[PDB]
């Protein structure tokens, strides 16, 4: 429908979007755990 | 020009710059500059036109005589107090020859006669890699040998570099010669601070490399060599217009935009000495080297030149390149005014 020689993208892939969401959730959880351990280290040392 | 061979040659450019940075011995400094030359010659002549051949010839002769002058200065250094350490030198003649070698290596105004010629007859990827890496790597060496330099050398070459890279530049309609003269002006702006606080020099290097990457990416998105092609890229797509606007006005160095953090912090840690006439002269020449940016902008995105058709045919086909990293470098190069206390990221 509507497209001679159907577009190479636009039809959504399913590896790259899941990879980006997975690494972004991983990066948020890592920085939150890093920040909480840093706050607990600051309150331990002081 | 196989992709394996290109990955190998770019890896050798990376390796040459790392060997320049990482060693505490003069032989690896010379080997790093030399391997950087030997690898950066076949990034040029990626085409086969005689333009790239003559450009690589000019670059090879100037680059090689700079390398031999460097080796002369190092052998004079071992004629005096004898060790191969990267520190304070022990001869004003040796430091004289070495600063002139690095001045030929990265371009000063008695030495810059190879820069617009070698940037004219090459494609944009080769110009990008030579500007970024060839003006990155010897700044490390000057940063290492800064406590033993006669000041008149650096400062005369820097003043003259800023004023000649300004004056030469109001007469070129080519893009690459404009960018080369801008490179000469920014080499002068980095060099004039180097005996006072070198954190400003390395931060100005970071800012100029990000600006040049944005500029050459906005010229890689649409193959242009003259400003008439820039007006046709006004006609084909509107976002390239406003980004050429913002990156040209950030090359100019206007205060709300992030091209003012290099100039103004240099003014600060220049005038915390008793040098005032030299900052006002340098910054009036910084007023001077904005005019060709501004006529470039008037050609691109403020007035509208009449465009040939077949843009009617080009409209069906979207700009389907891949950019290296255009939007991140754009917003980091232009919207980074209020993070000036990332100055102290560097020590």
């Amino acid at each position: 429908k509507f497209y001679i020689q159907e577009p190479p993208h636009g039809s959504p892939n399913w590896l790259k979007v899941g990879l980006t969401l997975g690494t972004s959730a991983f990066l948020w959880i890592y920085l939150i755990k890093q920040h909480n351990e840093d706050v607990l280290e600051y309150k331990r040392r002081n | 020009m196989n992709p394996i061979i290109l990955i190998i040659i770019l890896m050798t450019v990376m390796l040459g710059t790392i060997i320049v940075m990482i060693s505490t011995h003069w032989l690896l400094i010379w080997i790093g500059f030399e391997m950087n030359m030997l690898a950066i010659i076949p990034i040029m002549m990626k085409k086969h036109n005689p333009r790239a051949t003559e450009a690589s010839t000019k670059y090879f002769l100037t680059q090689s005589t700079a390398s031999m002058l460097l080796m002369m200065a190092i052998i004079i250094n071992l004629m005096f107090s004898g060790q191969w350490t990267v520190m304070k030198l022990f001869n004003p003649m040796a430091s004289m020859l070495m600063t002139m070698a690095l001045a030929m290596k990265l371009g000063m105004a008695p030495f810059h006669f190879w820069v617009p010629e070698v940037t004219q007859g090459i494609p944009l990827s080769s110009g990008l890699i030579l500007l970024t890496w060839q003006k990155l790597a010897p700044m490390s060496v000057l940063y290492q040998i800064l406590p033993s330099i006669n000041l008149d050398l650096i400062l005369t070459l820097s003043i003259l570099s800023i004023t000649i890279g300004g004056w030469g530049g109001l007469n070129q309609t080519q893009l690459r010669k404009i960018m080369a003269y801008s490179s000469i002006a920014h080499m002068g702006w980095m060099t004039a601070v180097l005996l006072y606080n070198p954190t400003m020099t390395l931060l100005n290097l970071i800012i100029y490399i990000i600006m040049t990457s944005t500029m050459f990416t906005l010229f890689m998105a649409n193959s242009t060599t003259t400003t008439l092609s820039l007006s046709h890229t006004w006609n084909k797509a509107p976002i390239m217009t406003i980004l050429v606007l913002i990156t040209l006005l950030s090359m100019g160095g206007l205060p709300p935009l992030s091209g003012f953090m290099p100039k103004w912090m240099i003014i600060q840690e220049m005038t915390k000495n008793d040098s005032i006439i030299l900052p006002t002269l340098m910054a009036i020449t910084a007023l001077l080297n904005l005019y060709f940016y501004m006529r470039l902008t008037y050609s691109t995105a403020l007035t509208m030149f009449p465009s040939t058709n077949n843009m009617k045919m080009k409209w069906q086909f979207p700009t389907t390149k891949r950019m290296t990293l255009l939007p991140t470098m754009t917003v980091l190069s232009t919207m980074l005014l209020p993070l000036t206390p990332i100055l102290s990221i560097l020590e």
Binding site: - | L249, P255, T280, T303
Partner: protein
């Protein structure tokens, strides 16, 4: 003051994600609400200033200019259709967002605690105006006008930065109180003279004075109405604001070194009032009028009397309102006839019966009508300069005579006597233009009732 900074930011994506033919109503309504909230500022009392941070603070000099900026925004944002109402949706949104960003940097600039921050937001005000006048200049020398604007205002304004860095690292911080409460006299050396000449000459470029005033008229006759009114009113009165703040330092040497600038300002005020008597190009008369009145402002700032500073800020605010309105009437007549000239568009007493009242009332507020604020400013400047010298009042009154002459000639030239009877396209006056005229005039008369607001620090 953050309660005024952040809704100016929030009014920007308003314009983007409002739909077609609804960006206008939302932006006008919300900027008028910002104007009411701006008028709620006026709290300033007696002994100190008011501090809206170690970052923001308001003198009573900055209060009426700030309310003037946030009042001149919606007036302009309504003033700038019918010459871009046929253009694209994206370019229209870009223009409106550019005006909002220019308001943002003007608020940044008027509530600038530090002089470094003042310089950065000064040239941040300088940035979008070039883009506005070049992209919508509607004439063929808009490139020349924007380029002269740029290089004049930078190349004058630039060693001011070097002088401010030198004061920054010879006397500590640059809050206006700790620049104050600590300021020591600076004797008649030569380096102090060059520091004074750098700072005062940067603002001399910005006002302008006579030797540097061709900066201005191209940037008004070759510019749209939005850039023209903001340029004239807020940028020139911002330059005067900046000189008022920075002249607290360098106390002794201004008597030694401030005679030739007084001179060039007075004789060029006379020559500029003379040059705007015989010109065509109706837009340019108000431009040279602005040059004359800001030369009067410059004489008022460089003499250092409290009467002079009260008269200076009153003259600033009154002339900002009058010249912005008179620019807007000139654009109204240019939208009636695509001329820009003066001897062509004749008649207009018979036709357009209501527009005569606005022309007459704006010409009388330019005439220094005596209960108005313009005569209050000019009168206190005349009092202070006759205290300065007993002989300079001749130039002031000769300026007064020629000012009345050219203003009333500008009235009786375009709108008095005979239609040229080959025009036959002019429509009766819209409600929009008269709404703009009523938004200009009525605050000026209501300040003429109670001018204890607009008199500045030395009330």
């Amino acid at each position: 003051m953050l309660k005024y900074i952040i809704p100016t930011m929030m009014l920007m994506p308003l314009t983007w994600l409002s739909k077609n033919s609804m960006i206008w109503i939302n932006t006008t309504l919300h900027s008028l609400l910002i104007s009411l909230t701006s008028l709620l500022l006026l709290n300033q009392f007696g002994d100190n200033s008011l501090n809206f941070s170690l970052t923001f603070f308001s003198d009573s000099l900055s209060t009426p200019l700030l309310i003037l900026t946030m009042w001149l925004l919606p007036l302009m944002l309504m003033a700038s259709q019918h010459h871009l109402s046929k253009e694209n949706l994206a370019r229209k949104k870009l223009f409106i967002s550019m005006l909002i960003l220019l308001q943002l940097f003007l608020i940044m600039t008027f509530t600038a605690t530090e002089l470094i921050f003042f310089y950065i937001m000064f040239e941040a005000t300088l940035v979008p105006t070039l883009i506005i006048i070049t992209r919508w200049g509607n004439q063929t020398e808009r490139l020349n006008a924007g380029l002269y604007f740029l290089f004049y205002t930078l190349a004058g304004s630039l060693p001011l930065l070097v002088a401010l860095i030198y004061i920054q690292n010879t006397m500590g911080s640059l809050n206006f109180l700790i620049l104050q409460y600590w300021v020591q006299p600076m004797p008649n050396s030569w380096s102090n003279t060059f520091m004074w000449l750098a700072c005062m000459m940067a603002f001399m470029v910005k006002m302008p004075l006579y030797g540097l005033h061709l900066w201005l008229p191209k940037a008004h006759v070759e510019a749209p109405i939005a850039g023209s009114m903001v340029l004239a009113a807020i940028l020139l009165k911002l330059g005067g604001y900046g000189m008022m703040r920075i002249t607290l330092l360098l106390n002794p040497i201004t008597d030694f070194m401030a005679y030739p600038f007084i001179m060039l300002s007075l004789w060029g005020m006379i020559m500029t009032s003379s040059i705007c008597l015989r010109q065509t190009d109706l837009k340019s008369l108000i431009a040279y009028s602005s040059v004359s009145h800001m030369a009067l402002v410059i004489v008022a700032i460089l003499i250092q009397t409290p009467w002079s500073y009260m008269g200076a800020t009153a003259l600033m605010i009154a002339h900002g309102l009058t010249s912005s309105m008179l620019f807007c009437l000139a654009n109204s007549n240019y939208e009636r006839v695509h001329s820009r000239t003066m001897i062509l568009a004749r008649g207009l007493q018979t036709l357009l019966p209501l527009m005569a009242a606005w022309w007459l009332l704006a010409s009388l507020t330019n005439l220094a009508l005596p209960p108005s604020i313009n005569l209050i400013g000019e009168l206190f400047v005349v009092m202070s300069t006759f205290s300065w010298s007993n002989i300079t009042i001749i130039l002031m009154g000769l300026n007064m005579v020629i000012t009345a002459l050219y203003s009333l000639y500008m009235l009786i030239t375009t709108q008095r006597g005979k239609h040229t009877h080959h025009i036959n396209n002019i429509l009766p006056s819209f409600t929009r233009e008269n709404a703009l005229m009523s938004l200009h005039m009525l605050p000026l008369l209501l300040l003429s009732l109670n001018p204890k607001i607009i008199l500045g620090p030395l009330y």
